[PDB]
Amino acid sequence: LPAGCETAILFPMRSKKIFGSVHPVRPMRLESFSACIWVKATDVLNKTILFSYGTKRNPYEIQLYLSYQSIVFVVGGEENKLVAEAMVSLGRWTHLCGTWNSEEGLTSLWVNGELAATTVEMATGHIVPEGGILQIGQEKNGCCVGGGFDETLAFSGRLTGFNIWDSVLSNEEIRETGGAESCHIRGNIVGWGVTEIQPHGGAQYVS
Amino acid sequence: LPAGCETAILFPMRSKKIFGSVHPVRPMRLESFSACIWVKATDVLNKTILFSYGTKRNPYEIQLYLSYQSIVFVVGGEENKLVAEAMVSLGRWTHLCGTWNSEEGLTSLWVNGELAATTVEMATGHIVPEGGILQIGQEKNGCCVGGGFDETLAFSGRLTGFNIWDSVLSNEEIRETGGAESCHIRGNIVGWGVTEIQPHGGAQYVS
Amino acid sequence: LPAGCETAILFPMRSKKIFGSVHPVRPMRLESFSACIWVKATDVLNKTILFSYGTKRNPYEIQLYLSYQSIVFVVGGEENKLVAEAMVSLGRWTHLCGTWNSEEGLTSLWVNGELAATTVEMATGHIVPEGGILQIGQEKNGCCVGGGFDETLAFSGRLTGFNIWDSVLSNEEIRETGGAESCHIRGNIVGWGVTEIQPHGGAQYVS
Amino acid sequence: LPAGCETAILFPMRSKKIFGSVHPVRPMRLESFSACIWVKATDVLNKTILFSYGTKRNPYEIQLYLSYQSIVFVVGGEENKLVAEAMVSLGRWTHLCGTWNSEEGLTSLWVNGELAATTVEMATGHIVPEGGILQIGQEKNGCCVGGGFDETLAFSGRLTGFNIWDSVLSNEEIRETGGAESCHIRGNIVGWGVTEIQPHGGAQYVS
Amino acid sequence: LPAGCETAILFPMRSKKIFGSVHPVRPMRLESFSACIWVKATDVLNKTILFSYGTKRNPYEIQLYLSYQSIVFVVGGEENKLVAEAMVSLGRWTHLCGTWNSEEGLTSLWVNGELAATTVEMATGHIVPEGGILQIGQEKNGCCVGGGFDETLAFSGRLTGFNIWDSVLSNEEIRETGGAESCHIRGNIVGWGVTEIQPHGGAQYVS
Amino acid sequence: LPAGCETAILFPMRSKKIFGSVHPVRPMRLESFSACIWVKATDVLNKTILFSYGTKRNPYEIQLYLSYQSIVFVVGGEENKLVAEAMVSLGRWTHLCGTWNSEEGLTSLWVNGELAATTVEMATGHIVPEGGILQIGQEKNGCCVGGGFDETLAFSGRLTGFNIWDSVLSNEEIRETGGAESCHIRGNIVGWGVTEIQPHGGAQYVS
């Protein structure tokens, strides 16, 4: 048994240098998906970056950030967004997730297994290419240049359970993955404790 | 071993290169402030520096060192120092901090939220500059060539919860910081777990 | 070698990891500017990076590449670019430089005291921002464990004498820049020996 | 390129990082001494150190620096100093032998044996102490911060042939030290090729 | 685990490179002294060298190891050795320490504060000098370029409770140090956590 | 440049850290041997090491050092040595060669292929084991104890012309080894580029 599945990372603070590198295996070609994470933040900012995907042409491919007391989920472009209202608390484990489907651009947020939002026609029909970079809580520009990254966009807190799916998991899957025994549940695109994750600049794993 | 806190640093040795490097962003032009930090020490010497700040002209710009059974807080230079009498032990947590008024040089000390000593006219008529060097448990001694840091003045023990404000915290404010649920509160000038702190020569973060 | 300038980067071979870094002082915003190069090339592809400025919002602003015996220069975007046809040789010293103004996008590529090419209203009303990245010999790609750059666009052979002025030079100093002892004058924006540049991934100088 | 002795050090760049360190053996107390070095000043600035020695009590124990076509010599304190005017041109071999005598503060300065500057009443009755830190062409500071050292005070070019003597060398010794086959001679306190010289942050030996 | 409740060092496997090096403060010139150590072993071979003070002319001036269930103490050289018979077992913490005196070569060992053996004429007429090399777990030098330290002598397990006193401790001092509240007492010549110790090749702290 | 060979080693300084390491393929149980050395010394203190082969038991197995103007050839201990009175200078090549016969101690020294000294019954009946360490220009002192290599025993200058044989060379062999083009040769037991050698502490390959 997992006996209390607990493996995570370390963010001693938000600096200009600490970062991590994601290294998936299969193409990022995406039209629909699912993804979730258990989080324990310390302090929210004007825009606190948790994770996001980008490309040389579009560094804003995927995105999820917290500003004050709400959640905004962005896809492929700044205009493309999904704001929540009053469902974030500091320093508390929480289940959160959102999804997109190209075929007519559905989007839904889902927290603690509970629907946080519902809305349609975002990134509608768009095709996600593959060839960019994925990082968790950082931007792209600033590698091996002595910082560079905007410290203003960094995050403080704990994270655990990063997993990505090729398809929008049903709402039953949404509620169940929020259960006390969902840590083992690992996605197809990315599996927590399976996909390569190597820290940098002061990141370390914590159990 | 909590002190109303989770993470801290480790100081396994009084070494010649062990020290902590801290790097805020805003300038250190200070006329008044407060700074509270939990401490748990192993052994006590005639003098053991902590968190001091200084300048290439005035390394003694501020200081706080520790004596066998007295605690001396220094501001500006050698001439201006306040001392606690007999309220220091070893291996136990304590809440120590005070404030400075440039206008009249007021000073305070507070052990476990309990006043220690009070006196006036220290660091008055003069301004704390900006851009100096901040460190911990050791003076800004030789750092690159050789260990360069004298052993006698180093520290062994547990320090964390260090933060900096810009104003004098009232007695209620200080006693609140003495509560077990105040770690989340942070100072604007320095936010613990947010401001830059990088360990050197033996310093090691711990949860 | 004829380049009296001692600093002489060598790029011994073309790989996916050999690269360098630069860190100028003052902002890169420029309504008019000029830059130059003294180079000895080993090999040329359909496209061979010389250098290029880049930002996360515009990976390419200024950009160069030897297209076999022809030179192509870039400003603003792929839409704007000037070309020179057959003014190159392999294994021989060569002086290259171009200029631009936002005033009327006036442009005239230069080559060893000759007018390599000319065009009007290139990048007029287009101000390069400040805070971007400049790279030489290669464009902006990854630099992680096995990420790296495009070896095909990597360069091999020696380079030297790179500097930047912040306006459009008149013909007098332009011609004297190719003088027998023009090494001493240094572009204010970039001075060959004042603006720091660091070899990486195998880079080294013939100094 | 030419040089009296083959072994030399290079300063091809000025930044906040490059610097060098020295590790002599004997104590640095001294009431009179003699010292010099051969330099190739590629460029000058408003103010920039050539070689200097300092400590926590006093960073200005000694400073030699140039001001355009003039050379400035400072001992002990900024007010305590001397200057010679309109001899230097960039990138040229030269010899200078400024010295001191605590007995009456007798300080003179030869330029290849021409008494460029000289006066009295400097540090009269003071003795250089022991226990400081030594460097060449740098302002003392902790670069472990990353940077720290001021770029504007950094030297660009080549320096070589540094020596220290326990007493003031007579005029005959001074004019002998500068011979075309004299760069072998070595100071007792600092012996060229015997006393330690550690390039740092980019400094390199072009021996 | 009376000793486990303290910071210590783990040695998971008996390797060719696992060891530690130190850098004490005062010279090691002695004629009498006390010393102790806390150990919990897993496997004992023909020999598992514990530690040994050695100089260039004699590596075996001081030497402690465990021969299966036998505890042999060697002083000066192989000529002198004192053996404890059956006071050691596997897999648990234990207390096994003693003292020596040159004046008449008196030697004695203790187990849990209980005498194990004593003798006379051991290292009489000889003195232990200062400036040698001390290691732990493995016997002699050859760290980086020597290939390593003889594997057969290597040890795997947990060690702690190391202190050095410059006098034969009385029986009361021995029994008090053998108690559970001896963590605060520390040797003046050397002490765990106060005297520099550097892990090498696998050994790491635990707390 | 001279001496025929185009491969040498530079010891720019006599520090506490520089030394030269060798890794012979074959064990060093030598009863008879031969070798040559080509040197230009820079400065000579009371003692100066050329090489010193040493084992743990007898660090003075085979040695060769210069004192002022006098060669000394120690082998196996202080009592056994061979000395040349005033047969050296500074800063020029010289073919120095001495051998040993374990049969009855036939030992001698050849300068520029010219007999310089000879003694008999030196190291008669004393055998050389295998398992020691060969170093050149310094005496084995330790490389991971924070330096300490005696600067007095270090070497300053550049060196080449080192080989080792399994037996004594004849007079014509010695003279040929001293020939004007005695390179394109390697010793029976050690050569150039074949013998594994790694500079450490400030040595440099040259050609």
UniProtKB/Swiss-Prot annotation, chains A, B, C, D, E, F:
Residues 5-207 form the Pentraxin (PTX) domain. The keyword Chaperone does not apply. Glycosylated. One of its GO terms (biological process) is negative regulation of glycoprotein metabolic process. Keywords: Coiled coil, Disulfide bond, Glycoprotein, Secreted, Signal. Disulfide bonds join C5-C183, C36-C97. It is found in: Secreted. The keyword Coiled coil applies. One of its GO terms (molecular function) is complement component C1q complex binding. Glycans are attached at N46. Its main location: secreted. GO terms for cellular component: extracellular matrix; extracellular region; extracellular space; specific granule lumen; tertiary granule lumen. Induction: By IL1B/interleukin-1 beta and TNF. Plays a role in the regulation of innate resistance to pathogens, inflammatory reactions, possibly clearance of self-components and female fertility. Homooctamer; disulfide-linked. Binds to C1q. This is Pentraxin-related protein PTX3. It comes from Homo sapiens (Human). The chain holds residues 175 to 381 of 381 of the full protein.
